[PDB]
Paper text:
Moderately conductive AtSLAC1 6D mutant adopted both the open and closed conformations. We obtained an open conformation of AtSLAC1 6D from the grids of relatively lower sample concentrations and sparse particle distribution. In order to achieve better resolution from homogeneous population, we selected two datasets showing mostly open conformation to determine the open state and a dataset featuring a large proportion of the closed conformation to determine the closed state structure with C3 symmetry, both at resolution of 3.3 Å. AtSLAC1 6D open state was modeled with the TMD region (residues 182-318, 329-506) except the faint density of intracellular loop 2 (ICL2) (residues 319–328), and closed state was modeled with the TMD and an intracellular plug (residues 150-516). Both 2D class averages and map at a low contour level of the open structure show the faint ICD density that is connected to center of trimer. Unlike the closed structure, ICL2s in the center of trimer make contacts with ICD and are pulled away from TMD. In the open structure, the ICD apparently pulls the ICL2 to the intracellular side, hereinafter “extended state”. TM5 is partially unwound and bent away from the pore axis by 9.3 Å translation and 27-degree rotation.
Slow anion channel associated 1 (SLAC1) is a slow (S)-type anion channel that generates anion (Cl- and nitrate) efflux on the guard cell plasma membrane and acts as a key effector of stomatal closure. Trimeric SLAC1 harbors N-terminal and C-terminal intracellular domains (ICDs) with the transmembrane domain (TMD) positioned in the middle. Multiple serine/threonine phosphorylation in the N-terminal and C-terminal intracellular domains activates SLAC120,21,27,28.
Residue numbers in the entry:
A (entry chain B), B (entry chain A), C (entry chain C): 182 to 318, 329 to 506
């Protein structure tokens, strides 16, 4: 059993969670509402560099597999559940782009338009091609989160009009996913094993949509508030449904679940700036504290379970 | 056959219809657009007291059954069609709360926040628990109307922010219900017998949503108008589809159908205040006249059929 | 085989495409953004008269069949796929009404209210009756486009309030159609033959809705922009999915596909007026050029294939 076979596409899950952490701490240092913490922006410098190293190493190793064992890649593509992970490498690169650590880049009004085109295009072509396969042969193949994220990148460039077009496309696909998935949610028992990639974008897409609305227009309306509150209601359902009595075991799939929690925390900070008050401030800090704590303990657990015991990679 | 067995949970239907009548006549006396009628506010005083008596008597008798024959209550819970009626006792109490007869309460800016918490919480816990049962074992178990009604109560207290959160949650559940129920509407023949509790909230939830929007913001927009017009279009479909040639017979289920009609009438009065004109005024009065007439004739019929013949309660 | 049997209801398809062309060229002559072309309004005079001749001839011949062979009409009604075409004669008359060639009518603020009632009523009665048949015996029987078109006619009369009511009804039916049709789109192979009437209103209803919003309110908002962008995204999917390598053959069904393209072009012109700029202007002209070119080449092809070879009408 060579190492290439035991290396699946699920490795990209860890990069998405860690990269999403970078945007959270950037806000905590550039938030006028949360100025009283005096958080040093140097934290983002370490986190952003760490996200680049893991993304390059993961991507480079996977490229070697694609030339060495193309047939293995071909087999993975067809399987229905693990298809969504093909979108993961493209969407994560956009997350680093919006971070854009202040120290590296001298102050400028907008980023160069060339950056948007290179990252965005491979995603749009993949979205249409993967959608066509479903018709030839649920509706879980559709990608929703990436379109909302691209709108944020487009707003940073300054192309306001195209950002509105991407938001409309992302919303339309959400309706089909929302109706089907809500009817049959996964059972509390054996939650991580079943439909783990698909579920993550169910508690995350609304929170991303609210952030995109704030960048395009600049003022909160019913779109940003209601989408944010829907995500909060869905997030609360996890606590009530999860069984505290039932035991839990370590699994690689836990890395993907981190990403939904982080996106909600960033969205809450936007709400606090628009509407000041003691309620919002405490709620924003609480969500951030839970998100960052889970990553730190999970990072230690996934580090020990891979080195001394080499149980991270199954046969 | 003891009286406890022949006493079902459908008795709560009559309370919902009569309690909804109270809010209608309160508006008719406090509407600047309909000032020319000079309606005495004393009508609400009689109606509100009458609603309290029936609600207490119905609730007190049912509590006796729950301790005497718990297993009978347990059997009723599982059956799919008659599950929605468990939400009915909680939602109706909120309807009396908004009425708040002026004579009883000295003029005050807002009501005490404690009233909102006691009534609302048992409903939110019930909504999550009942929804979980569906996943373990359509989508008719979901409750939609109560969330919109709670927003009205929250606005009366003055907690504007939480009212927006409840409205978002209620809207999201409506999408699943609207798609499924619209595909298979009940046939005109044997209309009352089939799916009678579920259908009532289909012509009623839009009208409640429009009222909630007016209280939170204060100015009509596309939300209030389009939701109100959707309810009107759905209400008109009943007249066209119902068969006049086919005969009708007395049934206990008719009490639930009163509640949808009353809610639409109250919503129309809001429209008349925002947009004045002869068209709206006549339409508002016509809907109220039909609603109040149906209750009076139905009340007499349900009174005679229960006393001289004792045919109200089946075996 | 008498000519009456070989004359189907699909003949009304050609009238819808040609009549829709009339509104496009009217805008091109009355558009301040596209003033630099100096397009003579005389083009609409020829087109509008040509649309009236074909509509009268098609309608008059079909009336003869309805009295001669009523049973044949009765058989056609039941078949599920070819039911939507019954709505086509009524909706097309509204399209000529909005055109209202300037030369014929002296300048006036609004049109007489009587015109709206005569055309609209037969459509509303048909919508309710056809919808009832589905319940007694997908959800493709529902009509969506006509309600949005009627709102435009109502706005021309000046009855603003009723136009909002029609828009709400049309939107509600769209949700059921959008969810069902999007799940199972037709395959690229043998595209014209399968579900040809139903598909045409899928790329067309959003574009009609955006135009109606602009007339009722007068200022673009998120309704007009997002609905327009959804239609653009759906239109682009046709180019990617269609197979260029696969050959194509002449068919009568191609006339219906013209109508979706024209409606999108008219909607784009509205966008250019609201938001000026070089991007929008070129995109508006390009869509119009493709639409008008397709009609001209198709008109020649459908003319030659019917006269020398008499292959237009199948047995
Ligand atoms: C794909 C995800 C990100 C969104 C899924 C949710 C949408 C299907 C629905 C939920 C409720 C709907 C909203 C209902 C109420 C409003 C407020 C409505 O009225 C306003 O104009 C708000 C601002 C104001 O004028 O005060 C604007 C659109 C919006 C947000 C609606 C847009 C579509 C929403 C967000
Ligand atoms: C759960 C029930 C109560 C609502 C179900 C209906 C909604 C799914 C849809 C129907 C049409 C949609 C509306 C379409 C048009 C508008 C107007 C739109 O534009 C405006 O800003 C209106 C006010 C103005 O700016 O003039 C605001 C949101 C809204 C109401 C939309 C919100 C979501 C609505 C109400
Ligand atoms: C039946 C067809 C014609 C429409 C099908 C699409 C609708 C189901 C959804 C898609 C996204 C929704 C929209 C989402 C965002 C908005 C913007 C929202 O916010 C605004 O107030 C826009 C204007 C502004 O205030 O800047 C108003 C309603 C609207 C258009 C929503 C109404 C309902 C929409 C159009
Ligand atoms: Cl940001
Ligand atoms: Cl996705
Ligand atoms: Cl009220
Ligand atoms: Cl309910
Ligand atoms: Cl026009
Ligand atoms: Cl249609």
């Amino acid at each position: 059993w060579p190492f290439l076979l035991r290396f699946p596409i699920g490795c990209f899950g860890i990069c998405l969670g860690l990269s999403s952490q970078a945007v959270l701490w950037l806000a905590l240092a550039k938030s006028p509402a949360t100025n009283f913490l005096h958080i040093t922006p140097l934290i983002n410098l370490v986190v952003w560099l760490f996200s680049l190293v893991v993304l390059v190493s993961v991507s480079f190793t996977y490229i070697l597999k694609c030339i060495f064992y193309f047939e293995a890649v071909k087999r993975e593509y067809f399987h229905p559940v693990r298809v969504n992970f093909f979108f993961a490498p493209w969407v994560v690169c956009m997350f680093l782009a919006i971070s854009v650590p202040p120290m590296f880049s001298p102050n400028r009004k907008y980023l160069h338009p060339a950056i948007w085109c290179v990252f965005m295009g491979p995603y749009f072509f993949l979205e249409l091609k993967i959608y066509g396969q479903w018709l030839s042969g649920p509706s879980s193949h559709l990608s929703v989160v990436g379109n909302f994220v691209g709108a944020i990148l487009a707003s940073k460039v300054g192309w306001d009009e195209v950002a509105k077009f991407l938001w409309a496309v992302g919303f339309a696909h959400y309706l089909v996913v929302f109706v089907t998935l809500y009817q049959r949610l996964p059972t509390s028992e054996a939650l991580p094993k079943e439909l783990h990639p698909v579920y993550s974008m169910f508690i995350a897409a609304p929170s991303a949509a609210s952030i995109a609305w704030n960048t395009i227009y600049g003022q909160f309306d019913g779109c940003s508030r209601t989408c944010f509150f829907i995500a909060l209601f869905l997030y609360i359902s996890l606590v009530a449904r999860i069984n505290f009595f039932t035991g839990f075991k370590f699994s690689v799939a836990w890395w993907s679940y981190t990403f939904p929690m982080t996106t909600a925390s960033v969205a809450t900070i936007k709400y606090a700036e628009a509407v000041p008050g003691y309620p919002s401030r405490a709620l924003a800090l609480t969500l951030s504290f839970i998100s960052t704590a889970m990553v730190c303990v999970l990072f230690v657990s996934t580090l020990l379970h891979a080195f001394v015991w080499q149980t991270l990679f199954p046969n």
